[PDB]
Design a protein around this motif. Structure first.
Motif, PDB file in Angstrom:
ATOM      1  N   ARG A   1       0.859  -1.199   0.000  1.00  0.00           N
ATOM      2  CA  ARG A   1       0.000   0.000   0.000  1.00  0.00           C
ATOM      3  C   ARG A   1       0.882   1.230   0.000  1.00  0.00           C
ATOM      4  N   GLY A   2       0.687   2.114  -0.965  1.00  0.00           N
ATOM      5  CA  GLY A   2       1.526   3.307  -0.998  1.00  0.00           C
ATOM      6  C   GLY A   2       1.097   4.323  -2.009  1.00  0.00           C
ATOM      7  N   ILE A   3       2.080   5.056  -2.510  1.00  0.00           N
ATOM      8  CA  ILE A   3       1.820   6.188  -3.371  1.00  0.00           C
ATOM      9  C   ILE A   3       2.917   6.305  -4.413  1.00  0.00           C
ATOM     10  N   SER A   4       2.531   6.851  -5.564  1.00  0.00           N
ATOM     11  CA  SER A   4       3.399   7.087  -6.708  1.00  0.00           C
ATOM     12  C   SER A   4       3.809   8.536  -6.784  1.00  0.00           C
TER      13      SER A   4
ATOM     14  N   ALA B   1       2.845   4.039   4.634  1.00  0.00           N
ATOM     15  CA  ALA B   1       3.074   3.382   3.347  1.00  0.00           C
ATOM     16  C   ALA B   1       4.177   2.350   3.470  1.00  0.00           C
ATOM     17  N   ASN B   2       4.075   1.266   2.709  1.00  0.00           N
ATOM     18  CA  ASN B   2       5.178   0.305   2.609  1.00  0.00           C
ATOM     19  C   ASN B   2       5.804   0.202   1.211  1.00  0.00           C
ATOM     20  N   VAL B   3       5.311   1.003   0.269  1.00  0.00           N
ATOM     21  CA  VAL B   3       5.842   1.015  -1.102  1.00  0.00           C
ATOM     22  C   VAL B   3       5.770   2.421  -1.666  1.00  0.00           C
ATOM     23  N   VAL B   4       6.763   2.761  -2.483  1.00  0.00           N
ATOM     24  CA  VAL B   4       6.716   3.973  -3.287  1.00  0.00           C
ATOM     25  C   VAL B   4       6.903   3.579  -4.740  1.00  0.00           C
ATOM     26  N   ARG B   5       6.325   4.356  -5.652  1.00  0.00           N
ATOM     27  CA  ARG B   5       6.446   4.090  -7.081  1.00  0.00           C
ATOM     28  C   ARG B   5       7.106   5.280  -7.743  1.00  0.00           C
ATOM     29  N   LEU B   6       8.087   4.993  -8.588  1.00  0.00           N
ATOM     30  CA  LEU B   6       8.842   6.006  -9.314  1.00  0.00           C
ATOM     31  C   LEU B   6       8.383   6.042 -10.761  1.00  0.00           C
ATOM     32  N   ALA B   7       7.636   7.096 -11.110  1.00  0.00           N
ATOM     33  CA  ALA B   7       6.973   7.177 -12.405  1.00  0.00           C
ATOM     34  C   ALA B   7       7.886   7.841 -13.419  1.00  0.00           C
ATOM     35  N   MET B   8       8.670   7.026 -14.113  1.00  0.00           N
ATOM     36  CA  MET B   8       9.626   7.567 -15.079  1.00  0.00           C
ATOM     37  C   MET B   8       8.981   7.595 -16.466  1.00  0.00           C
ATOM     38  N   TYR B   9       8.436   8.749 -16.849  1.00  0.00           N
ATOM     39  CA  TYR B   9       7.848   8.876 -18.185  1.00  0.00           C
ATOM     40  C   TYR B   9       8.945   8.565 -19.203  1.00  0.00           C
ATOM     41  N   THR B  10       8.527   7.957 -20.306  1.00  0.00           N
ATOM     42  CA  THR B  10       9.415   7.506 -21.378  1.00  0.00           C
ATOM     43  C   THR B  10       9.384   8.439 -22.597  1.00  0.00           C
ATOM     44  N   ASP B  11       8.191   8.927 -22.914  1.00  0.00           N
ATOM     45  CA  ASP B  11       7.894   9.701 -24.121  1.00  0.00           C
ATOM     46  C   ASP B  11       8.819  10.916 -24.250  1.00  0.00           C
ATOM     47  N   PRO B  12       9.571  11.003 -25.354  1.00  0.00           N
ATOM     48  CA  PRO B  12      10.441  12.166 -25.508  1.00  0.00           C
ATOM     49  C   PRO B  12       9.660  13.471 -25.591  1.00  0.00           C
ATOM     50  N   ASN B  13       8.426  13.397 -26.081  1.00  0.00           N
ATOM     51  CA  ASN B  13       7.569  14.574 -26.160  1.00  0.00           C
ATOM     52  C   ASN B  13       7.041  15.048 -24.801  1.00  0.00           C
TER      53      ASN B  13
ATOM     54  N   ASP C   1      17.443   2.444   1.751  1.00  0.00           N
ATOM     55  CA  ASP C   1      17.914   2.995   3.016  1.00  0.00           C
ATOM     56  C   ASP C   1      16.801   2.984   4.077  1.00  0.00           C
ATOM     57  N   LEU C   2      15.537   3.019   3.645  1.00  0.00           N
ATOM     58  CA  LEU C   2      14.392   3.073   4.558  1.00  0.00           C
ATOM     59  C   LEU C   2      13.682   1.734   4.767  1.00  0.00           C
ATOM     60  N   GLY C   3      14.096   0.705   4.044  1.00  0.00           N
ATOM     61  CA  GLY C   3      13.410  -0.592   4.105  1.00  0.00           C
ATOM     62  C   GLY C   3      12.018  -0.582   3.505  1.00  0.00           C
ATOM     63  N   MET C   4      11.840   0.209   2.442  1.00  0.00           N
ATOM     64  CA  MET C   4      10.571   0.270   1.722  1.00  0.00           C
ATOM     65  C   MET C   4      10.678  -0.492   0.421  1.00  0.00           C
ATOM     66  N   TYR C   5       9.547  -1.039  -0.040  1.00  0.00           N
ATOM     67  CA  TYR C   5       9.474  -1.594  -1.376  1.00  0.00           C
ATOM     68  C   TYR C   5       9.389  -0.414  -2.357  1.00  0.00           C
ATOM     69  N   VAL C   6       9.895  -0.619  -3.557  1.00  0.00           N
ATOM     70  CA  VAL C   6       9.968   0.441  -4.569  1.00  0.00           C
ATOM     71  C   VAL C   6       9.685  -0.122  -5.955  1.00  0.00           C
ATOM     72  N   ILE C   7       8.740   0.521  -6.647  1.00  0.00           N
ATOM     73  CA  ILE C   7       8.388   0.151  -8.009  1.00  0.00           C
ATOM     74  C   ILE C   7       9.071   1.083  -8.986  1.00  0.00           C
ATOM     75  N   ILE C   8       9.853   0.492  -9.882  1.00  0.00           N
ATOM     76  CA  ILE C   8      10.495   1.215 -10.963  1.00  0.00           C
ATOM     77  C   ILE C   8       9.563   1.101 -12.163  1.00  0.00           C
ATOM     78  N   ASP C   9       8.915   2.219 -12.502  1.00  0.00           N
ATOM     79  CA  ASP C   9       7.839   2.267 -13.508  1.00  0.00           C
ATOM     80  C   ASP C   9       8.303   2.903 -14.826  1.00  0.00           C
ATOM     81  N   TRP C  10       8.370   2.072 -15.868  1.00  0.00           N
ATOM     82  CA  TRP C  10       8.580   2.494 -17.251  1.00  0.00           C
ATOM     83  C   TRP C  10       7.246   3.063 -17.729  1.00  0.00           C
ATOM     84  N   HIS C  11       7.118   4.366 -17.578  1.00  0.00           N
ATOM     85  CA  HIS C  11       5.802   4.989 -17.555  1.00  0.00           C
ATOM     86  C   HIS C  11       5.363   5.450 -18.940  1.00  0.00           C
TER      87      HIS C  11
END
Length: 312
Positions: free
Chosen positions: A29-32, A57-69, A93-103
């Motif tokens: 449960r977390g936030i992006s 929260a126990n997870v964070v999501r990293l929203a890495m947009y891909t689109d060059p535009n 460093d914080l012991g959180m789960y992390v989502i690497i998002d090809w957005h």
């Protein structure tokens, strides 16, 4: 005061269930973040520490947009990769789960930047695969009438998964579905054969009502694992409302079924889905009056979910 990752370790998927390393049911449960190219200042250890300790929260999501535009990864790969690594290291460093998002989004077919995705995920899996914190989300929101499971999404996912799994055999991979990650019903016709795969469903409570919950229930009954890697309290635009009555129906539904969920978004954009009011401190520590109506709701849901877990 055990961290989420200390307590739960390496995650596993069996059928539709997410289990921890000790064979106990576990819900993320977390936030992006919003797009890191626009709101990356909020992806940092101080903000994430507030999410862990104060929001629960126990997870964070990293929203890495891909689109060059959109000034995404294809346009500025070095800056965005650096920001993703900052985000990942903060979670480690914080012991959180992390989502690497090809957005992906306006670059609506994940095949458009497939080889760039493979090179990116190969690097991330090499760097971070040893740690149980990391989750790979390989295509945020495939969309378009041609971009179907059988024709476009599954073949993309099969190639990217084989790339990742050659390096990181165990960590979770979340795979997007058609129509902005709504078309989870198409997966059961031809699922991916690999270990530790879940399929994304995204919803916005201004738009998506019980009908989509009914689809999710049907997918679960058929054996398709579901992960809500993005959801909002607004309309699908990210603005409007918020629609908290409908959002509450969704959170109850997801919690009852143990389905992991990640809210959009931790930023201070002037739109209803943004959790923070404009000018909020990038370093966290936000008083209730620096959170939006949506942010207050999410913080409350996270705290209540933890309480319900400890006692039920």
């Amino acid at each position: 005061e055990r961290t989420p990752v200390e307590e739960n370790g390496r995650l596993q998927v069996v059928g539709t269930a997410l289990l921890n390393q000790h064979n106990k049911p576990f819900q993320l449960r977390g936030i992006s973040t919003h797009g890191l190219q626009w709101f990356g200042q909020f992806a940092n250890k101080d903000a994430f520490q507030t999410l862990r300790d104060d929001w629960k929260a126990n997870v964070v999501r990293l929203a890495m947009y891909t689109d060059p535009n959109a000034n995404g990864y294809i346009a500025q790969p070095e800056w965005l990769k650096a920001k993703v690594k900052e985000g990942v290291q903060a979670a480690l460093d914080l012991g959180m789960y992390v989502i690497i998002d090809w957005h992906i989004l306006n670059d609506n077919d994940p095949n458009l930047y497939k080889e760039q995705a493979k090179r990116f995920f190969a690097e991330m899996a090499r760097e971070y695969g040893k740690y149980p914190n990391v989750i790979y989300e390989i295509a945020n929101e495939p969309n378009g009438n041609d971009v179907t499971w059988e024709e476009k999404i599954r073949p993309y996912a099969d190639e990217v998964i084989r790339t990742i799994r050659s390096i990181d055999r165990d960590n979770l991979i979340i795979v997007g579905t058609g129509t902005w990650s709504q078309d989870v019903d198409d997966v059961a016709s031809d699922p991916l054969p690999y270990k530790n795969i879940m399929y994304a469903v995204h919803f916005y409570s201004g738009t998506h009502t019980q009908w989509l919950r009914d689809r999710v229930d049907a997918a679960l009954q058929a054996g398709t694992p579901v992960f809500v890697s993005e959801w909002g309290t607004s309309d699908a635009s990210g603005d409007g409302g918020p629609y908290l009555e409908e959002a509450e129906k969704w959170i109850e539904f997801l919690n009852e079924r143990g389905i992991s969920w990640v809210n959009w978004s931790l930023c201070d954009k002037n739109e209803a889905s943004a959790a923070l009011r404009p000018g909020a401190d990038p370093h966290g520590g936000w008083g209730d009056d620096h959170l939006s109506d949506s942010g207050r709701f999410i913080k409350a849901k996270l705290i209540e979910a933890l309480e319900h877990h400890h006692h039920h």
